[PDB]
Design an enzyme around this catalytic site. Structure first.
Site, PDB file in Angstrom:
ATOM      1  N   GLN A  99     -14.918 -47.110  -8.110  1.00  0.00           N
ATOM      2  CA  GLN A  99     -13.992 -46.199  -6.905  1.00  0.00           C
ATOM      3  C   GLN A  99     -14.745 -46.529  -5.729  1.00  0.00           C
ATOM      4  O   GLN A  99     -16.189 -46.171  -5.902  1.00  0.00           O
ATOM      5  CB  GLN A  99     -13.894 -44.943  -7.590  1.00  0.00           C
ATOM      6  N   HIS A 180     -10.651 -45.033  -2.934  1.00  0.00           N
ATOM      7  CA  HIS A 180     -10.650 -43.610  -2.826  1.00  0.00           C
ATOM      8  C   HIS A 180      -9.864 -42.792  -1.969  1.00  0.00           C
ATOM      9  O   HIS A 180     -10.419 -42.684  -0.550  1.00  0.00           O
ATOM     10  CB  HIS A 180     -12.134 -43.052  -2.926  1.00  0.00           C
ATOM     11  N   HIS A 183      -8.773 -36.525  -2.187  1.00  0.00           N
ATOM     12  CA  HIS A 183      -9.936 -35.310  -2.157  1.00  0.00           C
ATOM     13  C   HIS A 183     -10.463 -35.350  -0.665  1.00  0.00           C
ATOM     14  O   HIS A 183     -11.703 -34.807  -0.455  1.00  0.00           O
ATOM     15  CB  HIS A 183     -10.964 -35.598  -3.162  1.00  0.00           C
ATOM     16  N   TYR A 185     -11.727 -37.297   1.579  1.00  0.00           N
ATOM     17  CA  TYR A 185     -12.244 -38.302   2.155  1.00  0.00           C
ATOM     18  C   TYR A 185     -11.812 -39.306   3.236  1.00  0.00           C
ATOM     19  O   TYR A 185     -10.562 -38.742   3.656  1.00  0.00           O
ATOM     20  CB  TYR A 185     -13.047 -39.234   1.081  1.00  0.00           C
ATOM     21  N   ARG A 232      -6.382 -44.018  -5.796  1.00  0.00           N
ATOM     22  CA  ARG A 232      -6.307 -42.630  -6.194  1.00  0.00           C
ATOM     23  C   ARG A 232      -5.730 -41.783  -5.170  1.00  0.00           C
ATOM     24  O   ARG A 232      -6.449 -42.130  -3.686  1.00  0.00           O
ATOM     25  CB  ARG A 232      -7.704 -42.127  -6.738  1.00  0.00           C
TER      26      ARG A 232
END
Ligand SMILES: Cc1cc2c(cc1C)N(C[C@H](O)[C@H](O)[C@H](O)COP(=O)(O)O)c1[nH]c(=O)[nH]c(=O)c1N2
Length: 363
Positions: A99, A180, A183, A185, A232
């Site tokens: 990831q 990624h 979340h 980021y 993701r």
């Protein structure tokens, strides 16, 4: 009936079961150098019966760093250390994805190169905390530093850092990469209107807010191959670090339709923060499934029973377990045999050493 223990083609690799190991930041890398360790290699090797291991979030660049103890995939020494870890997984007939993140504003000036402000879509503090290390090497929480907004001429460099990290991941022997984009980021900071007040072509409309992540997807597909790329997303609900704006379902379906055009290996949906959120409606799952034909991985407080139900309904193909994989290296065997799980020890999720990391026993 049970489908969790049947194979699944996931782009270029074939998983022997649908029980995946979720990406789990554990903050045990070596500093200086953000270097993976032999202990991390042992931890992943213990879990190599997973249908697919997805590694802890790993920096694409030094600037990407937001947590002390998170590993990178940008330096020679990091590449050399990861090669040992993927070789160990492969020695056990496992498969492992890396990831790749940039943390953007979920970071602190003290771990940025040069000690200056971290970067983001806009110059808005995340108003949360990240993880540093004290003078004894132990994990501590610290308020995030206010970011500066990326200048337009800096965005090609960010795309290139993701591209280069994927080139590095291929050399390091990973089977797949996972971008990624969840979340809160960096990629999600651009996706969300709450964190993105830009007035150039990277802000405003959903097309503009998804521009960066889709440039990254195109760059890494070109570098390696679309069937090596997963992504993701966490596009529904509020995450500690950000929310998804007032049109979250429509914006999510736009992004998923665009991702599908690239023919990538998989879509991994993180459905809830650890702190909870509203469940996905089955209507929304059907709209996702019809926009993304490839592998869909569901995550977020799943049980084996919830996974079997949704796999059997044809709405997801695999499940990623997070905390059950922390505590159960042989989670696949335990779920297949309906054996009890080891108890979780959340106090040792972040930082430290072997205790709470490699000392959870197999059956
Ligand atoms: C200690 C720890 C650390 C992380 C996480 C979780 C936890 C518990 N999670 C979220 C993780 O992938 C998974 O989505 C949630 O843990 C799945 O939920 P369950 O733990 O199975 O209930 C996470 N997610 C992610 O995309 N990249 C990561 O590095 C992390 N780091």
């Amino acid at each position: 009936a049970e489908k969790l223990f049947t194979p699944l083609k996931v782009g270029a690799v074939t998983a022997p079961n649908r029980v995946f190991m979720a990406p789990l930041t554990r903050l045990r890398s070596i500093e200086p150098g953000d270097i993976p360790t032999p202990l991390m290699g042992e931890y992943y090797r213990q879990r190599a019966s997973a249908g697919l291991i997805i590694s802890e979030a790993t920096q694409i660049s030094a600037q990407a760093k937001g947590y002390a103890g998170a590993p990178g995939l940008h330096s020679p020494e990091q590449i050399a250390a990861w090669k040992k870890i993927t070789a160990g997984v492969h020695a056990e007939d496992g498969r492992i994805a890396v990831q790749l993140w940039h943390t953007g504003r979920i970071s602190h000036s003290s771990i940025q190169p040069g000690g200056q402000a971290p970067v983001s879509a806009s110059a808005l503090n995340a108003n949360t905390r990240t993880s540093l290390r004290d003078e004894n090497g132990n994990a501590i929480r610290v308020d995030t530093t206010t970011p500066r907004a990326l200048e337009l001429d800096e965005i090609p460099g960010i795309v290139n850092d993701f591209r280069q990290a994927v080139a590095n991941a291929r050399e390091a022997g990973f089977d797949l990469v996972e971008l990624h984009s969840a979340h809160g980021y960096l990629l999600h900071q651009f996706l969300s209107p709450s964190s993105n007040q830009r007035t150039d072509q990277y802000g405003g409309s959903v097309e503009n807010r998804a521009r960066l992540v889709l440039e990254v997807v195109d760059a890494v597909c070109n570098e390696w191959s679309a069937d090596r790329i997963g992504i993701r997303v966490s596009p529904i609900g509020t995450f500690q670090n950000v929310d998804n704006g007032p049109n979250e379902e429509a914006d999510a379906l736009y992004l998923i339709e665009e991702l599908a055009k690239r023919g990538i290996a998989y879509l991994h949906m993180s459905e809830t923060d650890l702190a909870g959120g509203k469940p996905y409606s089955e209507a929304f799952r059907q709209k996702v499934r019809e926009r993304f034909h490839g592998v869909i991985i569901g995550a977020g407080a799943y049980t084996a029973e919830k996974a079997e139900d949704l796999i059997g309904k044809g709405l997801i193909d695999a499940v990623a377990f997070g905390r059950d994989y922390i505590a159960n290296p042989d989670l696949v065997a335990r779920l297949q045999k309906k054996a009890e799980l080891n108890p979780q020890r959340p106090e040792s999720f972040y930082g430290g050493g072997a205790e709470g990391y490699t000392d959870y026993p197999s059956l």
